[model samples]
Target: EVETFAFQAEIAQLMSLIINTFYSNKEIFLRELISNSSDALDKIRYESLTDPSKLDSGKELHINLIPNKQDRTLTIVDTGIGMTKADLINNLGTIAKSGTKAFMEALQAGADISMIGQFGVGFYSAYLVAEKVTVITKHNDDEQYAWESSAGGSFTVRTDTGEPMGRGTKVILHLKEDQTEYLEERRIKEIVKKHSQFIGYPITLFVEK
Candidate 1:
């Protein structure tokens, strides 16, 4: 049987790091993701000023936080810049731009923005806590694509069923049980404020109290 190349030894350790202790500040996920979403929206809005055609699309600079206790899932939906098939592959399938080396450099340099995620791929941080992720997104110039992955290695992208939220994305994270700390409203709000209070757009912190 012809097989693909296997993961290097550090790959396993890297997976372990991502699974166990990748994020020193677990509570920071809310803020980091919210900031990312806001940044995306800001990018699109800023772009629209130059490209009035962008206004024809429906995405706005808004975000939604929906927590499902029954399913033990926390959802962060956004109406920001959506991704194309190429965008999905670049973001979800592989780092595409700098890969692991750049991330390591960021760590070594103490999280500078340039080496951090300059190419603007903040979506994968969802992997830090989720067992599975469902991404529904549509771009102004491309068709919608749903990308799904557990993140140890490979990922899948298929045609989307639902229409795009006009021109943005929705990311649903089926979180791991131990990461349930995010299920609480107070916890969610605290995380949002701590990390994203300064974002250009509003960060809607939602939970059923």
Candidate 2:
């Protein structure tokens, strides 16, 4: 069965109050998101220590940035700890609530606004540059699913009957009007190289051979 849920009330307020205008630079959204991807990869890697066979053969720890100029879309994908349906609700919904609250409190207290999300409200920042966001993920314990939202209070999650996603997550950002800068390959390379270059996982700009 599929479900549609609303963001916690606090998160809804944060999106209206801060996420839309909090970040200093739109490009940094990629950085924050890539940082999250690195964290997710590290989590699975840590688990691999005890399990030994956590990754399927030839599967690797990597991130991919694929740009679609025609569609005005940017996609970032990670073959990391993919999410289950419950995780989609709890983690994206609840975590945003807590992180956004912490961020706003610090900022109101004169905390450096640039460091607002130092604790981790990075996901919501995607709204700064995207008109719509889509997350499709597959986890070992759950069937594939799709989660999508427009930064509005409500989000929808539905079962995906597509081919296997091979244990990972993909985030698709539909760039908003006047947000063309994020759609350039050169621009994307610079952002990823600047922010996520140190990430242990290989981050690549996907291109057709």
Candidate 3:
């Protein structure tokens, strides 16, 4: 079953601010996303410290960037702590009520902050380049679920029946017309080198033939 939820007023406003005024360097979108993937990987690793069963998926902790030129989409997949349906809604849908104040305050102060944990607003940076974003995530404790949004007033979450995914998150960005530069392997490599070079987990970019 699919459920639709409207963006909270503050979330809607923040989305507009992020897509329009936040980052002057559009390439920062790639950094924000990769950073988020790294955060997810870190979470799973930390959890597995106490509960090794979390790693039973047998997938190595890593990130993959797959840019499909023909499909005009850029996908970032991470073998990390994937979220449940409730996580998708609470984390992505109600950011304003949760962590927007700190995020907004950090933005206003021009202070550097990690995008994922404290702020919880980094995921929305995908809107900077994507007209639509779809996330398929599977957590060890929950069935796979899909979340989709156009960065509009609302978003949707539903049971995912696509190919079975290991415990992780897969984010597919349908690039906007002028944002197709992200589909190039060279561009992705350059961005990764510039921003995510220090990330511990291996980040692989699929080279399209």
Per-model TM against the reference: 0.80, 0.90, 0.90
Tell me the lDDT of model 1 at 55.
Answer: 58
lDDT per residue for candidate 1 within 159-209, as digits (tens), equals 786554687777888998888888888888777776667777666766575
| Sort by lDDT, top down from the best | 3, 2, 1
Q: Count the backbone clashes (under 3 Å) in each candidate.
A: 0, 0, 0
- Root-mean-square deviation per candidate: 4.5, 2.2, 2.4
Range of the 10 consecutive residues with the lowest summed lDDT in candidate 1: 1-10
Model 3 per-residue lDDT at 135: 94
C-alpha positional error of residue 184 in candidate 1 after TM-score superposition, expressed in Å: 1.0
lDDT by residue for model 2 over 39-93, one digit each (tens)?
A: 7788778888888677762258889999888888899999887888888887552
Number of backbone clashes in candidate 1? 0
Alpha carbon lDDT of residue 182, candidate 2?
A: 87
Q: Score residue 82 of candidate 3 by CA lDDT.
A: 89
* Model 3 per-residue lDDT tens digits across residues 106-206: 76787543353357677877888899999999989799999999977899999998698888999999999999999987889999999889999999999
Model 3's TM-score against the true structure: 0.90
